[PDB]
Amino acid sequence: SPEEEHPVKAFGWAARDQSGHLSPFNFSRRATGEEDVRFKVLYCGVCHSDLHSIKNDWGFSMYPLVPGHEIVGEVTEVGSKVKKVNVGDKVGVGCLVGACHSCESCANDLENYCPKMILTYASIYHDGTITYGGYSNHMVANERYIIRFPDNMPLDGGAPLLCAGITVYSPLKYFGLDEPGKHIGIVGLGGLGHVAVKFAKAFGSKVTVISTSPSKKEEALKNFGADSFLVSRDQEQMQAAAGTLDGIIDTVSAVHPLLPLFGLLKSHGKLILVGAPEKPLELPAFSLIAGRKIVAGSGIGGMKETQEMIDFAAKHNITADIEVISTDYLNTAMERLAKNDVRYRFVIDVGNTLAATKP
C-alpha cells in the first residue's frame, strides 16, 4: 500500500478513478536525504493540468492520483549537503522534481526537456515509486528543484507562478516576444492566460487578448492593461486585427480553431501552443506556408529560469489574481474550473484546511 511505501507518513486528497473525484488519502514520502529539502505545504494553486489528469483526459493517468504542482510552503528539515535554504525559509516546488542530470538538456538547464524528467505528480520517481502532488500536508524534493520565494512575494498569490507563470514567461523569452514595442497575443484569459498578460506588459509589449468570454473584456483592458480585447467568435472583430501580432501564446485547454489565430499573425509570426487539448488540433498548411509562419510548443521551464521568473515577478510586483479555497472545496472548485468559473486561479489554503479533513 502507499501508506507503507515510504518511512514518513503523509496525507492529502487523491482521485481513485477517471471520475476525478477527490477525497482524503493516506500515503507517505521518502525520508529526507543529504540533498533533499522538506517543507510544510502552506499553499498550492490549482492548475487545469490537475483537472485533465484526474479525469484521465490524456489517458496517461495512474491512480490513486494526488494532484498539485504549484506548491508553496515553509522549510522544516534539510539534509546535510543542502546549501541555499534553511529551516523556516519560504520555498516552492513546481511541475518538476527530478531528471537524469546528464544529457545535454540538463546541462543546459532544461530538466523540463529531459527524456527522463520526473513530474511532480502522477510520474515515476528515481526509486520507481509513484510521485504525489502538493495537495498534501508536506513535500520533499532535491534542492535543485526547490525554488526560493522572494521575501516580498506573497505565499498564496505567487504559487501559480510556479507553473502557470514559468510556463508563459519561458516562451516569451525563448521566441523573442519579450521585446518592447512588439505585439503579443494571449489566447484564453485563464490561469496561464492572465499571468501571461502581466509578464507581456511587464516586458513592454502591446498586448492583445483573444477570448471566448466577453464578460472578461473590462478586466482584461482595465486591470491587466491589455491594449486590445477580441472575442474569437466574432469574425468581424477578429478579421479587423488581421496580421497585427508578432507572436501569440495559446493557453486554450480544449480543441479550438487555429486558422483564425494565424490570421492575426504578421508575416513570419509565431504561434506558441502551451495549452494541452485532449485531442489533435487542426493545422491548415497554407496558413504556415503563406507568410512562413510557425507553430511551436513549450512546456513549463527548467529550474534555473523558473527561479529567474519568480525573482522577476517579485521585482515587478506580479502576482496571480486568486481565489483561496478550503481543501474540502476541491470537488466544487474542479467543476468550476471545468466550467470557466474562476476569476483566474484557485489556490488551496492547505496549511489551515487540510488537517481538518481527515476521517
Ligand X SMILES: NC(=O)c1ccc[n+]([C@@H]2O[C@H](COP(=O)([O-])OP(=O)(O)OC[C@H]3O[C@@H](n4cnc5c(N)ncnc54)[C@H](OP(=O)(O)O)[C@@H]3O)[C@@H](O)[C@H]2O)c1
Residue ranges for the binding site for NADP(+)?
A: 47-49, 52, 189, 191-192, 211-213, 216, 274, 276, 298, 300, 340, 345
Q: What's the rounded Cα separation, in Å, for the pair 87 and 351?
A: 17
Residue 26 engages ligand X in binding (rule: CB under 6 A):
no
Residue 86 engages a copy of itself in binding (rule: CB under 8 A):
no
Q: Closest separation between CB of residue 4 and ligand X, Å?
A: 32
Q: What's the rounded Cα separation, in Å, for the pair 111 and 97?
A: 9
Q: Closest separation between CB of residue 147 and a copy of itself, Å?
A: 21
Sign of CA pseudo-dihedral 48, 52, 58, 62: positive
Residue 106 engages Zn ion in binding (rule: CB under 5 A):
yes
For residues 134-193, which are near Zn ion according to CB under 5 A? 163
Q: Which is nearer to Zn ion, 49 or 137 (CB)?
A: 49
Q: Closest separation between CB of residue 110 and a copy of itself, Å?
A: 8
Q: Closest separation between CB of residue 276 and ligand X, Å?
A: 4
Residues within the annotated binding site for Zn(2+)?
47, 69, 100, 103, 106, 114, 163
In the chain, the largest separation of any two C-alpha atoms, in whole Å, equals 63
Q: Closest separation between CB of residue 225 and ligand X, Å?
A: 16
Q: Closest separation between CB of residue 47 and Zn ion, Å?
A: 3
Residue 267 engages a copy of itself in binding (rule: CB under 8 A):
yes
With CB under 5 to 8 Å by kind, the binding choice for 315 among ligand X, a copy of itself, Zn ion, none is none
In sequence order, what are the beta bridge partners of 323?
Answer: 346
Residue 325: which residues within 8 A CB-CB, separation 6 or more?
46, 333, 346, 347, 348, 349
Give the 3-state secondary structure of residue 274: coil
42 phi, psi to nearest 5 deg: -90, -55
Give the 3-state secondary structure of residue 297: strand
Q: What's the rounded Cα separation, in Å, for the pair 195 and 321?
A: 9
The DSSP letter of residue 124 is: B
With CB under 5 to 8 Å by kind, the binding choice for 198 among a copy of itself, ligand X, Zn ion, none is none
Q: Looking at 136, 211, 228, 327, which residue binds ligand X (CB under 6 A)?
A: 211
Q: Answer whether 301's CB lies under 8 Å from 166's CB.
A: yes
Binding pattern for the stretch 154-193 against ligand X, x by CB under 6 A and - elsewhere: ---------xx--x--------------------xxxxxx
* First-to-last C-alpha distance (Å) of the chain: 18
Identify which range of 114-122, 150-158, 236-244, 340-348 contacts Zn ion by CB under 5 A. Answer: 114-122
Count of chain residues binding ligand X (CB under 6 A): 30
Q: Answer whether 188's CB lies under 8 Å from 211's CB.
A: yes
Residue with the three cell numbers 495559446? 250
For residues 227-256, which are near ligand X according to CB under 6 A? 251-254, 256
Residue environment code for 235-253, b if the CB has 16+ CB neighbours within 10 A, otherwise e: eeebeebeebbbbbbbbbb
With CB under 5 to 8 Å by kind, the binding choice for 284 among Zn ion, a copy of itself, ligand X, none is a copy of itself
Q: What's the rounded Cα separation, in Å, for the pair 128 and 108?
A: 25
Residue with the three cell numbers 486561479? 345
Give the 3-state secondary structure of residue 68: coil
Identify which range of 96-104, 241-249, 271-279, 327-335 contacts ligand X by CB under 6 A. Answer: 271-279
Residue 208 engages ligand X in binding (rule: CB under 6 A):
no
Task: Report the DSSP pairing between strands 228-231 and 206-211.
Answer: parallel
Binding pattern for the stretch 21-60 against Zn ion, x by CB under 5 A and - elsewhere: --------------------------x-x-----------
Interface residues toward a copy of itself, by CB under 8 A = 58, 105, 113, 115, 174, 258, 267-268, 273-277, 279-299
Interface residues toward ligand X, by CB under 6 A = 47-49, 52, 163-164, 167, 188-193, 211-213, 216, 251-254, 256, 274-276, 289, 299-300, 337, 340
